[PDB]
């Protein structure tokens, strides 16, 4: 793993190199979105621009100084976050957690689904749990402005679950499609109640 | 429960949505929060997510 690299670097390497699982570039991106972008209609849905997103990645990778995001399109930054969580070596929510969500929504009754989800999250590594707590707080703050951005928790889940779970998409078996639906449902449930 | 699309829509890339044309009928498999529905498009035989705002019950 190269020195000062953000994308494609697992959270454990980030912890061993800096002491925190999320890089400061990604945290500053989240702060920029929280401070100057929460009212943008269709955030995380309206696509950015490939050139601007690639310039943002250029900024992140190799920069020893602090990465400034002022004067950047909100959708470019949102798509950059989606690409960072997509470009992780393993998904933030481990490959087993999508199957666990499927098992929860299939065999666990509705009144105990939240407890099973919390237990499943507690079965994750410490770094993944910290990053997930930070990201869930951020997405709750985002969806709190639903009167301005029209981003409901389920809408945010639809936009972000493929990046967080590393799901498949068709143009895949039935079990995998059920896993996709259950992962989206679980992400929406976690975002709605945070 | 079946629905019919009243407007064309293109999938957001790298998501579980499905594109459809005006008139496409879907069979609703699951109903989610905020008007989202997991459905199978009868034209393309693909399963995915659609929003209630673009469909009408039949």
Author numbering:
A (entry chain B): 1070 to 1240, 1258 to 1280
B (entry chain A): 282 to 339
Which statements did the authors publish about this structure?
Deleted in liver cancer 1 (DLC1) is a tumor suppressor and ubiquitously expressed RhoGAP protein; its activity is regulated in part by binding p120RasGAP, a GAP protein for the Ras GTPases. RhoGAP proteins are key regulators of Rho family GTPases and influence a variety of cellular processes, including cell migration, adhesion, and cytokinesis. These GTPase activating proteins (GAPs) downregulate Rho signaling by binding and enhancing the intrinsic GTPase activity of Rho proteins. RhoGAPs enhance the intrinsically inefficient catalytic activity by directly binding the GTP-bound GTPase and contributing a conserved arginine residue, the so-called catalytic “arginine finger”, to stabilize the transition state of the GTPase enzyme active site and catalyze the reaction. One major binder and regulator of DLC1 is the RasGAP protein, p120RasGAP (RASA1; RasGAP, p120GAP). This was the first RasGAP identified and is a key regulator of Ras signaling. p120RasGAP is a multidomain protein containing two Src homology-2 (SH2), one Src-homology-3 domain (SH3), a Pleckstrin homology (PH) domain, presumptive calcium-binding C2 domain, and a RasGAP domain.
We determined the co-crystal structure to 3.2 Å resolution, and observe clear electron density throughout, including the key residues that mediate the protein-protein interaction. There are 4 copies of the DLC1-p120RasGAP complex found in the asymmetric unit, and they are experimentally identical (RMSD between 0.3 and 0.6 Å over 251 Cα atoms). We, therefore, determined the co-crystal structure of DLC1 RhoGAP domain in complex with p120RasGAP SH3 domain. This structure of a RhoGAP-SH3 interaction reveals that the RhoGAP domain cradles the SH3 domain in a manner competitive with its binding to RhoA. The p120RasGAP SH3 domain latches onto the DLC1 RhoGAP domain using its RT and n-Src loops and additional contacts are made between these latches by residues in the β2, β3 and β4 strands. On the RhoGAP domain, the bulk of the interface comprises residues on the solvent-accessible faces of αF and αG, with several more contributions from the αA-αA1 loop, αB, and the FG loop. Mapping the interaction regions on the surface of the two proteins reveals a single continuous binding site that buries a total surface area of 1550 Å2 comprising approximately 8% of the DLC1RhoGAP surface and 20% of the SH3 surface, with a shape complementarity score of 1.00 (Pisa server). The most notable feature of the RT loop binding is the direct interaction with the catalytic arginine finger residue Arg-1114 in DLC1 RhoGAP, located in the αA-αA1 loop. Specifically, Arg-1114 forms a salt bridge with the sidechain of Glu-298 and a hydrogen bond with the sidechain of Tyr-290, and additional van der Waals interactions with Val-293 in the RT loop and Trp-317 at the start of β3. We observe no material conformational change in either the SH3 domain or RhoGAP domain upon complex formation when compared to the previous apo structures.
